[PDB]
Amino acid sequence: DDTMLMLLKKDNATYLSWSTDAGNVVRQDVYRSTSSAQAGSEKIAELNSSDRTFTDLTANPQSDYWYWVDTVSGNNSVLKSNAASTAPAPLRAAPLKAASPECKAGAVIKDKTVDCGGITLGLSCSGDSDKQPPVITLENATIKNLRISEKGGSDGIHCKSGNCRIENVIWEDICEDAATNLGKTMTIVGGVAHNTTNGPGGKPDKVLQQNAKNSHTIVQGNFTLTGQHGKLWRSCGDCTNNGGPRNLTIISATVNGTIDSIAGVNRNFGDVAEIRDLRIKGYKEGKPPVCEEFNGVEKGKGKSDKYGEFWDTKNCKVSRSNVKPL
């Protein structure tokens, strides 16, 4: 077994994101050292078994740090992750780590699991191109450990069909959607999504977009948004042959920046957004709205417009106790 740890250093935080295949995890420890030596490391977090990210707000931006995440199983066993660091990558002593050959920009992955081993991929925006390929397309597939970047933003990942699992992906540059579900169940497991929204069409991004009907997106492992975003998840408002139900389950997620709303459901189409364990920087009620209900409209026949924010309804299965500041 192993744990693949990556980070994203921004000006106001260092985000940790990992995937692991450790069995029956009961706790996870986050270590940080001011040197490359693990011996000097201090435990800076004690996490539950399901978290796959961590936001470090205490590190000096001007200084290099090294990080490790250890998983602890019920049977007393411990897994240690690779070191991740804000210092440049070593040319020496570093652990060898392969990427799947199939990890390429524009790849179509079908009926398997690929581990991209922390590489960076990217393709420029669709809608500003032609019939532009998603940087990765999944058909009943899983992708792990991928950094996505491109100046002006890159295409996100599509779940074209079947069930898709997207584990420990860091979206450093987003055009409109980090991930689009056109299939059955799309599951986001940890990962980090950045967008300083000052390079699309002026219009706010939708990190997770759902266009398939009878579809489900699952957000878990404390998937984290950073920068400024439009929505975290959106059932397509004005799709061709628009309809539902389109479902969202957030098991855990964090928003460490500004956002216009968490989830956008079409009430007239039976969309159900279930939200639990959501953390938002500076959260006050209505700031931002969490679950917004919309009128779901057919393409070309109007605008999908905002009803308002709702709690504890058929479409907005979320209570105020589900949402807290960071």
Automatic annotation (TrEMBL):
Its cofactor is Ca(2+). Disulfide bonds join 103-116, 125-175, 159-164, 236-239, 291-316. Ca(2+) binds at residues 173-174, 195, 200. Gene3D superfamilies: Immunoglobulins, Single-stranded right-handed beta-helix, Pectin lyase-like. GO terms for cellular component: extracellular region. PANTHER family: PECTATE LYASE F-RELATED (PTHR33407). This is Pectate lyase. The gene is pel-3.
